Amino acid sequence: HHHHFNLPPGNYKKPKLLYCSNGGHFLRILPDGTVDGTRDRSDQHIQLQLSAESVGEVYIKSTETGQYLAMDTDGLLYGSQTPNEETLFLERLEENHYNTYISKKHAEKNWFVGLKKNGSCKRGPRTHYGQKAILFLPLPV
Numbered sequence: 001h002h003h004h005f006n007l008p009p010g011n012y013k014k015p016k017l018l019y020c021s022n023g024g025h026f027l028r029i030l031p032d033g034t035v036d037g038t039r040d041r042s043d044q045h046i047q048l049q050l051s052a053e054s055v056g057e058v059y060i061k062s063t064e065t066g067q068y069l070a071m072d073t074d075g076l077l078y079g080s081q082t083p084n085e086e087t088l089f090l091e092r093l094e095e096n097h098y099n100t101y102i103s104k105k106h107a108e109k110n111w112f113v114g115l116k117k118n119g120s121c122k123r124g125p126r127t128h129y130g131q132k133a134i135l136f137l138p139l140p141v
Contacts, residue, residue, distance in 0.1 A: 002108050007056055008093040008138075015049045015063050016138040017041070021098070023117035027136070029062040029069060035077035037119040047141050050091070057104060058091045059083055060113075071103040075111050075124020089113060098135040 018027040025037025026046040038046065047063040060069040067079035068087040080087050088104040101113040103124060111124030114133035122133050 006093040008099045012050045018136045020115040022132040025119045029079045033079035037115040077121045
């Protein structure tokens with residue numbers, strides 16, 4: 001392991017909104033595969049269904065479009081039509097409260113799913129432990 005194994009409570013029984021305390025945006029996967037954040041709770045592309053592959057590993061899927069969150073080779077998030085190795089994330093508890101998601105494929109590089117204050121996604125290499133951008137709270141839909 002390149003990372004700790006403190007896991008968040010909660011489960012995957014129901015879909016969730018992934019709220020980023022950094023700018024106050026919900027993670028969004030647009031039909032065209034674009035990934036970003038929005039403060040509009042009514043948005044139909046922020047409802048996400050998480051599922052576990054192995055303990056602590058998850059897929060994060062758009063309930064509206066069926067797409068999987070993924071991080072590509074240059075650290076950019078995108079919506080993938082199918083589950084590949086870029087769609088698995090290490091879901092961990094952080095600061096004894098939040099949920100963080102590390103790219104499994106690029107786990108050794110500490111690339112996280114993250115949103116900037118302006119609602120744009122962070123590119124993998126620009127994220128790291130200790131940032132506010134990587135902190136999420138799963139909220140009921």
